[PDB]
């Protein structure tokens, strides 16, 4: 058809123009400019606390906003709240579905979000007059496994599922106020901006997309990976982010430049990255692999500076405190470790 | 502890009580059998569940002779299988259902590829997975009565051009069973259980119970070191 041919040629011309515009703004590289700075020495971290009590593989965790409490989820059917300072358990929530794959902590400390592989996102209220934790709202409407959920405030939450669609919900009512579509493969992870105005998502089609909470449509798309994307995280500044994939390669993308800056990979690593996180100052990039240990990279020189060995199975979750005092890693051996 | 105040020892006692409750609840979840269910969609898994009946994940819990079975059906998911299959690594057994009347039938989307070839490819993919290298597979063959009714009107040579036999019920059943069992590549770590479905629930329940008991006793003998 003439219309189909003209649409295809218009799309090809637009893609070529976008590629040419991206190439035009490429004058130098991050490594060459940064090479003049003094590299940081070897980083030594030792475990302090060991959190035990789970009886199955741990799939998600999230640090509290006070840098003292955390929450962990595992397939045994329990959601456990840990006090890191004294290694005490505050609450243990029995789940209706044991196939949990994500969890999230409210920024105010009153609610906890749970979900995964059940098309239902549950909200649990911690501050109750009756003295027990009870579910307050069940959100439904997805047609695929739930992969990630993040709080915005006490009445807003953003979720991503396996149906190639992200949703912004309203807890009080229970209806999707905004839907984001455009991904081909399944959506695996999302990251919220510090100002809670934009967020980014990574999909199984080796792509990442920058969305808009207030507007509701995609803004920019980033490519470069050769396999599935499993993790994503914003820079502390908020003008760049990092992606981890299954081809033993991490990448750093810039929102303002809309291009690639640095690539972190080694010839001795052939496994897949499972978690990606940053530091308080944005200098250390922590990557949790499935080779039973985590790695620490220099975000400005792409040189490895430490390995956090100590886990006997896959490392699936990793988190860094708001004040940057410690880092918590979880694994499939039902053990959590705190490093500093 | 001596440094702990009066408001810190009560927290320790509460944590110990939580630990005791978790330990008590964890020993009851290991006394139940977990069975994954797979198939070809319309291969007849629904009627198999119906014979032994008491969105993405369907759970069926039922007891028989003081033994509890929990069965996970994942038919209504429609997602990427490789991104969540490792969640079912610790299942006791995987049930795979095959219809005997699909050899003449073809796929609705395309008539080039038979339903039998698709079922065989699915069985080969599931059996040789890296996560299920030591998990038992129970193969059910259903819709045998209609297959027997229609066997005379169409030779099996349409589905298998290289077949040369008496074109009777026993020979065709043995040939199909052998072709399904020949797809195994380990032959030392896992075995395939084959049964022909009947109209009586008791036979199917007894076969499932015997299979799971044999799997459990073999596994525990292997862990004991004698086997």
């Amino acid at each position: 058809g003439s219309e189909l041919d003209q649409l295809r040629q218009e799309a090809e011309q637009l893609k070529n123009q976008i590629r040419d515009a991206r190439k035009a703004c490429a004058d130098a590289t991050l490594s060459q400019i940064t090479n003049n700075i003094d590299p940081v020495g070897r980083i030594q971290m030792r475990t302090r606390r060991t959190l035990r009590g789970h009886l199955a593989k741990i799939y998600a965790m999230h640090w509290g906003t006070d840098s003292r409490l955390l929450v962990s989820a595992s397939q045994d059917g329990k959601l456990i709240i840990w006090d890191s300072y004294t290694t005490n358990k505050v609450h243990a929530i029995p789940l209706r579905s044991s196939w949990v794959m994500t969890c999230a902590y409210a920024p105010s400390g009153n609610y906890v979000a749970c979900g995964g592989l059940d098309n239902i996102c549950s909200i649990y209220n911690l501050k109750t007059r009756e003295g027990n934790v009870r579910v307050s709202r069940e959100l439904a409407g997805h047609t695929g496994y739930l992969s990630c959920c993040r709080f915005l405030d006490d009445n807003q939450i953003v979720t991503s599922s396996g149906d190639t669609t992200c949703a912004l919900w309203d807890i009080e009512t229970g209806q999707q106020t905004t839907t984001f579509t455009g991904h081909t493969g399944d959506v695996m992870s999302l990251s919220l901006a510090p100002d809670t105005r934009l967020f980014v998502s990574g999909a199984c089609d080796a792509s990442a997309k920058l969305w808009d909470v207030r507007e509701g449509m995609c803004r920019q798309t980033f490519t470069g990976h050769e396999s599935d994307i499993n993790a994503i995280c914003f820079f502390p500044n908020g003008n760049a982010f990092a992606t981890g994939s299954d081809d033993a390669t991490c990448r750093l993308f810039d929102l303002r430049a809309d291009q690639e800056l640095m690539t972190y990979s080694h010839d001795n690593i052939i496994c897949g990255i499972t978690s990606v996180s940053f530091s308080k100052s944005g200098r250390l990039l922590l990557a949790g692999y499935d080779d039973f240990n985590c790695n620490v990279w220099d975000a400005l020189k792409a040189d490895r500076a430490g390995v956090l060995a100590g886990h006997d199975n896959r490392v699936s979750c990793l988190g860094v405190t708001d004040d940057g005092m410690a880092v918590a890693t979880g694994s499939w051996d039902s053990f959590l470790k705190i490093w500093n | 502890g001596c440094t702990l105040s009066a408001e810190d020892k009560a927290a320790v006692e509460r944590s110990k009580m939580i630990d005791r409750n978790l330990r008590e609840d964890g020993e009851k979840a290991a006394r139940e059998v977990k069975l994954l269910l797979l198939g070809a969609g319309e291969s007849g898994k629904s009627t198999i569940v119906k014979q032994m009946k008491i969105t993405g994940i369907v759970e069926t819990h039922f007891t028989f002779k003081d033994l509890h079975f929990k069965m996970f059906d994942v038919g209504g998911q429609r997602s990427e299988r490789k991104k969540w299959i490792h969640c079912f690594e610790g299942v006791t057994a995987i049930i795979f259902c095959v219809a005997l009347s699909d050899y003449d039938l073809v796929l609705a989307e395309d008539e080039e590829m038979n339903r039998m070839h698709e079922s065989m490819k699915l069985f080969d993919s599931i059996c040789n997975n890296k996560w299920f290298t030591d998990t038992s597979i129970i193969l059910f063959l259903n819709k045998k009565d209609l297959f027997e009714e229609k066997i005379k009107k169409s030779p099996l040579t349409i589905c298998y051009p290289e077949y040369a036999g008496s074109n009777t019920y026993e020979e065709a059943a043995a040939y199909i069973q052998c072709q399904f069992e020949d797809l195994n590549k380990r032959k030392d770590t896992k075995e395939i259980y084959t049964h022909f479905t009947c109209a009586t629930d008791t036979k199917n329940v007894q076969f499932v119970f015997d299979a799971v008991t044999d799997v459990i006793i073999k596994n525990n003998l292997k862990d004991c070191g004698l086997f």
Partner: single-chain antibody
Amino acid sequence: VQLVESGGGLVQPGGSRKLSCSASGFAFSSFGMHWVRQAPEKGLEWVAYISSGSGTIYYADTVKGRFTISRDDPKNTLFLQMTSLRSEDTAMYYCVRSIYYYGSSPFDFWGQGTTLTVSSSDIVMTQATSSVPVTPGESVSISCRSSKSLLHSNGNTYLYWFLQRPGQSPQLLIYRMSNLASGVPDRFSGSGSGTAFTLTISRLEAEDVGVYYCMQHLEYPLTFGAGTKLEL
């Protein structure tokens, strides 16, 4: 949520009695229980404490070896058995719930109270004043002092402020000397350091008339302060 206690009445000096209270509206099996005594025209007095699961039981030196405390979670009931009753056991008895974990606020609900009449080291906590006549529209400051420092190595300061309206059960106002309770106006404030503590109230109305008590929870036994009265 409500606690209802009973078992009162007048008895001869030689006799044994049982006080029974029932809880309804919350998980009775997750809250530790305290018994509090109040002599007529006097202040409060701690009696006994039982933990969740009957793990730790604490008694008062005055009634040690003479009072028994029992808990029934099947029936959601608390029992207090008294064997020998002297002439100083005539008072009002309350039942208090308290849950201990990181960020919790003990001493939430104080029950209703029952009357018991009979015919015929520790930390000293002191109240500065005893009666301050005031008028609505002005701030009121109340001072409390402790013999020993209530500050711990972790930084906590176990101080609790209470208020008993005329004919009403006491209620919690401030816990740990800095944290405001739930359901009270933001006007009430508390502060202090070391052995000195201050409670300030602003924009008083006619309904804020009662007695304020300062209590320490650093170590057992729990000692209540004196009583400061306010007038309209």
